[PDB]
């Protein structure tokens, strides 16, 4: 019987998207803010909206919830834009190939242009996981 | 309407198969329409395993299994609910249900 | 058991032109179907085709251009007179602007328009447009 309707959840998401700078994990403070900052027609859904806000307060302090509020949206610039690492994951100059694909780059005329040590491949040819239920 | 592509039966390049008999009702079905079920039920009924091994004359006795093959007419396969009616698009698969033993 | 060899070849051309293919392979070659194909190559439907000489009946590889709509065959080689030809035209041609019922005469395998520029009614052999 606790489960909250669509209009309580929808209108509380537009607060935390928009007034996250003013809210905290206290019920009785946010109950006063949502009174001042939204137009709530009656008192029961005032503090029923404000309860879902504080439920969203502990929820967004852990991780990326459906939370397009600015601070959670800005910090992912420190992940996808930053970490251009000072070392390369492409440049090691000791990389392995196989004796069939050392034929491949020789007709590409890059056989003596590269270092490119080879590894001899297994002759087992076991590829193709067993058919049938057991 | 033809309901199924094969006619409920796995015969293709034949004309006649052996007829077998249902287990509970003893009805004559062909061998390749009948709903088969191979049962490897333990004969000891696992609630009574720690009641016979302490009466056993051994200290580690590997209990025999019971090896029963069932094969049903489909008239009794649905009534005993070993198979269930399926929807017209979830029906076109022959894959068996997952096991879920422990 | 190939009762008609023009019928099989020209069925084979028709399936690949609607399939989008640039070449076909026609397994028996004949002197009726190399004179058949140089009536539509001359009117401009197919391009360069090669006869593959073998010691049994040869093969034909045709370069399809894309300008072909249908290249059927009238399978009983009916006889058509020049009186009777005008009611063959309006049955199995899409229009009077284009398309040819190609028919074998005593003077050679011709068009329908070549058949009446000469006076050479013959046996109907196929049609193409």
């Amino acid at each position: 019987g606790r489960v909250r309707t669509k209009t309580v959840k929808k209108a509380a998401r537009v607060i935390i998207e928009k007034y996250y700078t003013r809210l905290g994990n206290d019920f009785h403070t946010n109950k006063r803010v949502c009174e001042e900052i939204a137009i709530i027609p009656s008192k029961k859904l005032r503090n029923k909206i404000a309860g879902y806000v504080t439920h969203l307060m502990k929820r967004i302090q852990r991780g990326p919830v459906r939370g397009i509020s600015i601070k959670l949206q800005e910090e992912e610039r420190e992940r996808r834009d930053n970490y251009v690492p000072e070392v390369s994951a492409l440049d090691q100059e000791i990389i392995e190939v196989d004796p069939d694909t050392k034929e491949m780059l020789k007709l590409l005329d890059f056989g003596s242009l590269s270092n490119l040590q080879v590894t001899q491949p297994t002759v087992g040819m076991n590829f193709k996981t067993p058919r049938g239920p057991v | 309407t033809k309901k199924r592509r094969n006619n409920g039966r796995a015969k293709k390049g034949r004309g006649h198969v052996q007829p077998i008999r249902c287990t509970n009702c003893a009805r004559c079905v062909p061998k390749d329409k009948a709903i088969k079920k191979f049962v490897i039920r333990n004969i000891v009924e696992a609630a009574a395993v720690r009641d016979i091994s302490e009466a056993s004359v051994f200290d580690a006795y590997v209990l025999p299994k019971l090896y029963v093959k069932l094969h049903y007419c489909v008239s009794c396969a649905i009534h005993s609910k070993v198979v269930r009616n399926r929807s017209r698009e979830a029906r076109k698969d022959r894959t068996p249900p997952p096991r879920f033993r422990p | 058991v190939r009762m008609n060899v023009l019928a099989d070849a020209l069925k084979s051309i028709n399936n690949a032109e609607k399939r989008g293919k640039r070449q076909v392979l026609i397994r028996p070659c004949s002197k009726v179907i190399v004179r058949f194909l140089t009536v539509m190559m001359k009117h401009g439907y197919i391009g360069e085709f090669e006869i593959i000489d073998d010691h049994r009946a040869g093969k034909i590889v045709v370069n399809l251009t894309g300008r072909l709509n249908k290249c059927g065959v009238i399978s009983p080689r009916f006889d058509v007179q020049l009186k009777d030809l005008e009611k063959w035209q309006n049955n199995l041609l899409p229009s009077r602007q284009f398309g040819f019922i190609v028919l074998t005469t005593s003077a050679g395998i011709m068009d329908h328009e070549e058949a009446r520029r000469k006076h050479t009614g013959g046996k109907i052999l196929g049609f193409f447009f």
């Binding site: - | - | 401009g44 894309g66 300008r67 899409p94 229009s95 602007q97």
Partner: protein, 220 residues
């Protein structure tokens, strides 16, 4: 008052696309009905075909919707066909015109022979199938008229075509399908390669790349 949302309707209200016959030849998906109302305004008469009361079985009684069939078109080579379910006739018959002009095709006109002047019939004999009905529109000689059933003659005279022999197989008393079958035959007169269309087409510049100015400079 009509503001558009797509490029093709945005580039028409500023009168930069001229004479529709290029947005056919680039095969644009027309989305709003006001583009076809813009070019061919004051040349469209819009007369209905049948209004049939389809209905479904429900828990108590029967939902009755209405199925209005209207075909639109000038006398110069454009036809439409509009079909729409709605709860009431007057709004089914209204929105079907919106569906009829939005699905509009050019019909190609040809000659029976002796190409003396304006084209008057179908260029070749053409077919359309929809369900079980096939309608075969056959090139007629000059001075024939439309030799057909009443309802495909409603679309042929609305195609600006002078004369056409016609045959039809099937349940021709299935007016919804017997109108879509005749619509499909005159929808493929430009989809049929005749020997006047052999030479390799020079490709002109499409209005989405020729009018990148008005989306970059004026829209943005």
């Amino acid at each position: 008052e009509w503001m558009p949302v797509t490029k093709l309707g945005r580039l028409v209200k500023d009168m930069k696309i001229k004479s529709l016959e290029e947005i056919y030849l680039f095969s644009l998906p027309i989305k709003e009905s006001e583009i076809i109302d813009f070019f061919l305004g004051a040349s469209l008469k819009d007369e209905v075909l049948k209004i049939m009361p389809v209905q479904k079985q429900t828990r108590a009684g029967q939902r009755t919707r209405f199925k209005a069939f209207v075909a639109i078109g000038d006398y110069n080579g454009h036809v439409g066909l509009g079909v729409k379910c709605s709860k009431e006739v007057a709004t089914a018959i209204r929105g079907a015109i919106i569906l009829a002009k939005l699905s509009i095709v050019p019909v190609r006109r040809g000659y029976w022979g002796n190409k003396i002047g304006k084209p008057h019939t179908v260029p070749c004999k053409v077919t359309g199938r929809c369900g079980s009905v096939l309608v075969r529109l056959i090139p007629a000689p000059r001075g024939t008229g439309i030799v057909s059933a009443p309802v495909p003659k409603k679309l042929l005279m609305m195609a600006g075509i002078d004369d056409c022999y016609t045959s039809a197989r099937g349940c021709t008393a299935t007016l919804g399908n017997f109108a879509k079958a005749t619509f499909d035959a005159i929808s493929k007169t430009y989809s049929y390669l005749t020997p006047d269309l052999w030479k390799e087409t020079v490709f002109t510049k499409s209005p989405y790349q020729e009018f990148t100015d008005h989306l970059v400079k004026t829209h943005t």
